[PDB]
Short mmCIF file of C-alpha atoms in Angstrom, two decimals:
data_model
loop_
_atom_site.label_atom_id
_atom_site.label_comp_id
_atom_site.label_asym_id
_atom_site.label_seq_id
_atom_site.Cartn_x
_atom_site.Cartn_y
_atom_site.Cartn_z
CA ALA A 23 1.64 30.71 -2.26
CA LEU A 24 -0.38 33.61 -0.79
CA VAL A 25 -1.58 33.65 2.99
CA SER A 26 -4.09 36.66 4.02
CA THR A 27 -3.60 38.87 7.06
CA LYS A 28 -6.36 37.57 8.69
CA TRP A 29 -4.96 33.92 8.24
CA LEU A 30 -1.64 35.02 9.93
CA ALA A 31 -3.37 36.97 12.74
CA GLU A 32 -5.15 34.06 14.11
CA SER A 33 -2.04 31.88 13.67
CA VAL A 34 -0.17 34.56 16.09
CA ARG A 35 -3.02 34.95 18.53
CA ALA A 36 -3.31 31.07 18.73
CA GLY A 37 0.53 30.98 19.33
CA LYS A 38 1.05 28.88 16.33
CA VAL A 39 4.34 30.43 14.85
CA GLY A 40 7.37 28.40 16.13
CA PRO A 41 9.27 25.51 14.40
CA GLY A 42 6.30 24.80 12.27
CA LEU A 43 5.64 28.25 11.13
CA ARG A 44 8.28 30.86 10.97
CA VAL A 45 7.31 34.45 9.64
CA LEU A 46 10.34 36.57 8.09
CA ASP A 47 10.35 40.43 7.36
CA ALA A 48 12.14 40.53 3.99
CA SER A 49 12.32 44.27 3.87
CA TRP A 50 15.26 46.22 1.93
CA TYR A 51 15.20 49.94 0.45
CA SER A 52 17.49 51.97 -1.61
CA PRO A 53 20.15 53.98 0.13
CA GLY A 54 18.83 56.76 1.55
CA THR A 55 14.76 55.99 1.83
CA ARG A 56 13.81 53.94 4.81
CA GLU A 57 16.33 51.57 6.84
CA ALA A 58 14.72 48.06 6.75
CA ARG A 59 16.92 46.59 9.58
CA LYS A 60 15.98 49.37 12.10
CA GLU A 61 12.35 49.39 11.18
CA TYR A 62 12.35 45.79 11.68
CA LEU A 63 13.69 46.19 15.25
CA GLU A 64 11.12 48.65 16.18
CA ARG A 65 7.73 46.94 14.92
CA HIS A 66 7.08 43.65 13.46
CA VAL A 67 4.36 40.76 13.32
CA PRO A 68 4.95 39.17 16.99
CA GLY A 69 7.52 36.28 16.33
CA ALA A 70 8.59 37.33 13.01
CA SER A 71 12.40 37.26 12.24
CA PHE A 72 14.34 39.57 9.90
CA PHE A 73 15.73 38.23 6.92
CA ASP A 74 18.63 40.29 5.44
CA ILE A 75 19.19 40.31 1.67
CA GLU A 76 22.36 42.13 1.92
CA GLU A 77 23.72 39.10 4.07
CA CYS A 78 22.12 36.15 2.33
CA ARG A 79 23.62 36.90 -1.02
CA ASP A 80 26.78 36.07 -2.75
CA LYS A 81 29.05 38.86 -1.15
CA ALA A 82 31.97 38.17 -3.56
CA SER A 83 29.94 38.41 -6.71
CA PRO A 84 30.39 41.81 -8.53
CA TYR A 85 26.81 41.71 -9.40
CA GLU A 86 23.74 42.55 -7.28
CA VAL A 87 22.14 40.71 -5.06
CA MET A 88 23.04 36.99 -6.33
CA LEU A 89 22.10 33.94 -4.76
CA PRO A 90 24.40 32.38 -2.13
CA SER A 91 25.87 28.67 -2.18
CA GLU A 92 23.49 26.14 -0.72
CA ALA A 93 25.62 25.94 2.27
CA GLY A 94 25.58 29.83 2.69
CA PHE A 95 21.54 29.44 2.41
CA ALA A 96 21.22 26.35 4.66
CA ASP A 97 23.28 28.06 7.61
CA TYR A 98 21.36 31.20 7.49
CA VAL A 99 18.04 29.73 7.36
CA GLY A 100 18.73 27.18 9.83
CA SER A 101 19.83 30.01 12.64
CA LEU A 102 16.49 31.44 11.98
CA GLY A 103 14.88 28.17 13.22
CA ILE A 104 13.84 27.32 9.76
CA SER A 105 13.65 23.36 9.18
CA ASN A 106 12.92 21.58 6.04
CA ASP A 107 9.26 20.86 7.57
CA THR A 108 8.47 24.38 8.54
CA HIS A 109 5.76 26.52 6.79
CA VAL A 110 7.60 29.88 6.20
CA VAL A 111 5.66 33.18 5.48
CA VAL A 112 7.56 36.16 4.04
CA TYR A 113 6.03 39.77 3.85
CA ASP A 114 8.11 43.10 3.66
CA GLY A 115 6.87 46.69 4.46
CA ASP A 116 6.91 48.42 1.16
CA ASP A 117 4.19 51.22 0.10
CA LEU A 118 3.37 49.00 -2.74
CA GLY A 119 2.24 46.05 -0.80
CA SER A 120 4.97 43.51 -1.93
CA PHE A 121 8.68 44.42 -3.27
CA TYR A 122 11.09 42.18 -1.72
CA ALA A 123 8.88 39.33 -0.36
CA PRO A 124 8.80 37.32 -3.82
CA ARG A 125 12.39 37.29 -4.19
CA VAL A 126 12.81 35.47 -0.59
CA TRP A 127 9.87 33.37 -1.54
CA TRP A 128 11.75 31.90 -4.79
CA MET A 129 14.81 31.97 -2.99
CA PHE A 130 13.51 29.04 -0.51
CA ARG A 131 12.02 27.28 -3.58
CA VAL A 132 15.17 27.44 -5.76
CA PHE A 133 16.74 26.08 -2.91
CA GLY A 134 14.27 23.12 -2.77
CA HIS A 135 11.95 24.19 0.09
CA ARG A 136 8.12 24.26 -1.24
CA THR A 137 6.18 25.12 1.98
CA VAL A 138 6.80 29.08 1.83
CA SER A 139 3.93 31.85 1.35
CA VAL A 140 3.85 35.71 0.62
CA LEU A 141 1.29 37.44 3.25
CA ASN A 142 -0.88 39.10 0.76
CA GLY A 143 -1.31 42.85 1.45
CA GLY A 144 2.11 42.97 3.13
CA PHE A 145 3.10 44.83 6.43
CA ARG A 146 1.27 47.75 5.06
CA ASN A 147 -2.20 46.13 5.32
CA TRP A 148 -1.32 44.12 8.67
CA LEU A 149 -0.77 47.95 10.06
CA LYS A 150 -3.79 49.14 8.42
CA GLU A 151 -5.96 46.35 10.00
CA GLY A 152 -4.60 47.13 13.34
CA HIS A 153 -2.93 43.80 13.92
CA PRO A 154 -0.54 43.59 16.78
CA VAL A 155 3.06 44.50 16.50
CA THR A 156 6.03 44.11 18.86
CA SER A 157 9.53 45.53 19.21
CA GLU A 158 10.90 42.39 21.52
CA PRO A 159 13.37 40.11 19.70
CA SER A 160 12.58 37.16 18.27
CA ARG A 161 14.80 34.46 19.13
CA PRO A 162 14.27 31.09 17.74
CA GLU A 163 15.70 27.59 18.44
CA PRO A 164 18.28 26.86 15.54
CA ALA A 165 17.29 24.20 13.29
CA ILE A 166 18.90 22.27 10.54
CA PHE A 167 17.99 22.97 7.18
CA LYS A 168 19.01 21.15 4.06
CA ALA A 169 19.29 23.14 0.92
CA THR A 170 19.69 21.65 -2.58
CA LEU A 171 20.03 24.03 -5.66
CA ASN A 172 16.76 23.40 -8.00
CA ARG A 173 18.60 24.31 -11.06
CA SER A 174 15.25 24.40 -12.93
CA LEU A 175 14.31 27.68 -11.33
CA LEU A 176 17.39 29.83 -11.98
CA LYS A 177 18.78 31.05 -15.67
CA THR A 178 22.66 31.59 -15.67
CA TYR A 179 24.11 34.52 -18.10
CA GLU A 180 25.22 31.62 -20.53
CA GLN A 181 21.93 30.11 -20.82
CA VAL A 182 20.21 33.44 -21.32
CA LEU A 183 22.73 34.20 -24.05
CA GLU A 184 22.09 30.76 -25.97
CA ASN A 185 18.55 31.51 -25.78
CA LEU A 186 19.03 34.51 -28.11
CA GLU A 187 19.31 32.18 -31.11
CA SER A 188 17.42 29.28 -29.98
CA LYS A 189 14.39 30.98 -28.64
CA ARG A 190 13.38 28.26 -26.43
CA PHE A 191 12.22 30.20 -23.41
CA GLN A 192 9.75 33.33 -23.55
CA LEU A 193 12.12 36.28 -21.47
CA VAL A 194 9.68 38.43 -19.61
CA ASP A 195 11.47 41.73 -18.12
CA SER A 196 9.48 43.25 -15.13
CA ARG A 197 11.24 46.58 -14.85
CA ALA A 198 9.19 49.87 -15.24
CA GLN A 199 8.38 50.60 -18.74
CA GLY A 200 10.80 53.60 -19.15
CA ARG A 201 13.75 51.72 -17.94
CA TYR A 202 12.92 48.79 -20.10
CA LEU A 203 12.95 50.98 -23.04
CA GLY A 204 15.98 53.14 -22.35
CA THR A 205 14.07 56.26 -21.99
CA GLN A 206 14.59 56.57 -18.24
CA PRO A 207 18.06 55.95 -16.35
CA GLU A 208 18.53 52.96 -14.15
CA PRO A 209 18.74 53.99 -10.57
CA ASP A 210 21.34 53.37 -7.85
CA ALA A 211 24.03 52.90 -10.23
CA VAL A 212 26.79 55.02 -11.92
CA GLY A 213 27.39 54.81 -16.02
CA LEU A 214 24.77 51.67 -16.31
CA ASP A 215 22.60 52.41 -19.41
CA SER A 216 18.99 51.22 -19.24
CA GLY A 217 17.59 49.35 -22.40
CA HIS A 218 16.66 45.82 -22.67
CA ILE A 219 17.68 42.27 -24.11
CA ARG A 220 16.66 41.81 -27.47
CA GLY A 221 13.36 39.77 -27.62
CA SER A 222 12.21 40.23 -23.99
CA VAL A 223 8.84 41.10 -23.40
CA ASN A 224 8.01 43.99 -20.75
CA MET A 225 5.63 43.22 -17.71
CA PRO A 226 6.09 46.01 -15.35
CA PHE A 227 5.82 44.12 -11.89
CA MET A 228 3.50 46.97 -10.13
CA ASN A 229 0.64 46.33 -12.24
CA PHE A 230 0.42 42.65 -10.53
CA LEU A 231 -0.93 44.81 -7.45
CA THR A 232 -3.89 46.92 -6.75
CA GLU A 233 -3.37 50.19 -5.57
CA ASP A 234 -4.30 48.67 -1.92
CA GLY A 235 -1.41 46.63 -2.17
CA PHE A 236 -2.92 43.36 -2.59
CA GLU A 237 -2.10 40.52 -5.38
CA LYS A 238 -4.80 40.77 -8.16
CA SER A 239 -7.04 37.82 -8.69
CA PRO A 240 -6.00 34.72 -10.72
CA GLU A 241 -8.24 35.69 -13.38
CA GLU A 242 -6.93 39.06 -14.00
CA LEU A 243 -3.18 37.73 -13.57
CA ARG A 244 -4.20 35.38 -16.60
CA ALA A 245 -5.66 38.07 -18.65
CA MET A 246 -2.38 40.09 -18.09
CA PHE A 247 -0.22 37.23 -19.68
CA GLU A 248 -2.60 36.65 -22.37
CA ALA A 249 -2.72 40.13 -23.59
CA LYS A 250 0.96 40.41 -23.84
CA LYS A 251 0.91 36.87 -25.42
CA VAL A 252 3.06 35.12 -22.77
CA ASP A 253 1.89 31.58 -23.36
CA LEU A 254 1.92 29.90 -19.80
CA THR A 255 2.24 26.44 -21.20
CA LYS A 256 5.53 27.30 -22.63
CA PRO A 257 9.22 27.78 -20.99
CA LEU A 258 9.23 31.52 -19.18
CA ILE A 259 12.53 33.24 -17.80
CA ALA A 260 11.90 36.54 -15.88
CA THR A 261 14.47 38.92 -15.61
CA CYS A 262 14.70 42.69 -14.29
CA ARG A 263 17.47 44.85 -12.90
CA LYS A 264 18.83 42.44 -10.17
CA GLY A 265 16.59 39.24 -9.96
CA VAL A 266 14.02 40.92 -7.46
CA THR A 267 11.12 42.35 -9.15
CA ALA A 268 11.29 39.39 -11.60
CA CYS A 269 10.24 37.32 -9.11
CA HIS A 270 6.80 38.96 -9.07
CA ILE A 271 6.21 37.39 -12.54
CA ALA A 272 7.25 33.93 -11.26
CA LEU A 273 4.78 34.40 -8.14
CA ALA A 274 1.87 35.72 -10.47
CA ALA A 275 2.47 32.57 -12.86
CA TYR A 276 2.58 30.34 -10.21
CA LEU A 277 -1.02 31.49 -8.99
CA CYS A 278 -2.17 30.75 -12.69
CA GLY A 279 -0.64 27.32 -12.50
CA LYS A 280 2.85 27.50 -13.92
CA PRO A 281 5.00 26.55 -11.17
CA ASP A 282 8.38 27.03 -12.83
CA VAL A 283 9.07 30.32 -14.04
CA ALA A 284 12.76 30.59 -13.84
CA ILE A 285 14.71 33.51 -12.92
CA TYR A 286 17.70 35.35 -14.22
CA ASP A 287 19.43 36.32 -11.30
CA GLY A 288 22.29 38.41 -12.83
CA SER A 289 19.27 40.43 -14.58
CA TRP A 290 20.14 43.72 -16.39
CA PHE A 291 22.93 44.59 -14.13
CA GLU A 292 24.96 41.37 -15.14
CA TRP A 293 23.76 41.33 -18.55
CA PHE A 294 25.07 45.04 -19.23
CA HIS A 295 28.42 44.37 -17.90
CA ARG A 296 28.97 40.84 -19.76
CA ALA A 297 27.00 40.85 -22.78
CA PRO A 298 28.31 41.73 -26.50
CA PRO A 299 26.52 45.41 -27.01
CA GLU A 300 24.40 43.93 -30.04
CA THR A 301 22.26 41.78 -27.89
CA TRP A 302 20.48 44.71 -26.15
CA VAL A 303 18.78 47.70 -27.59
CA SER A 304 17.84 51.41 -25.93
CA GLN A 305 16.00 54.01 -27.28
CA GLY A 306 18.66 56.45 -25.88
CA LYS A 307 20.38 54.86 -28.81
CA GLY A 308 22.85 53.27 -26.28
#
């Protein structure tokens, strides 16, 4: 699931990107910090297309960045020249090294595509290492992509609610500790309290990355799940604010050998608007 900058740079130089290897910039940033779409248009790895999280989602949903239908995903990805036989590599240019890129890797897999990788180090290290960048448009041939929802890799509201009595799945929240505890507010929202679903364990997503922006080694990732007593041989759902940093637990677990962490896509935003208040706690008392 991880490709290095070195590997990607050699493939770009040898002219290997095209129908068998597609590269995606999956960047997105909060209102008022960076503009992802504009930054893409100006500098990208040669041959890379932009994957727009704002477009490829269920736009009619009241909740944040929910999965599109199979058809909606299929059409979008087909127009970027990705077929079922394509190896897809996704990166984003966040300062941490990786923020939205694990969400897109999971998106391809929850729609049945297994050949997808995240650029280890992100665009931040592509740039740091001086690898080539262009402003010229990537214009790929359309392809046909067949999506099949892979229901094992997704959890819905109802399934997470039933789990509160049955405890059949470990639930791990990837949000920063203060937000999980309820001591820090939820960003980019008005009236949403912070806090966590009763029974979830917290594993802040940023701790899987080194200060340089790279993924920690499998050895270290294993040691991280063991210290929080998250058993990787048992069912495990990852949740966060809107289903995005949760995918970093799926990715980390995938590198330790567990390929089936499911993501609660509605996450805290859906949960707070739909669940009985007794199902979650906050140190801000509510």
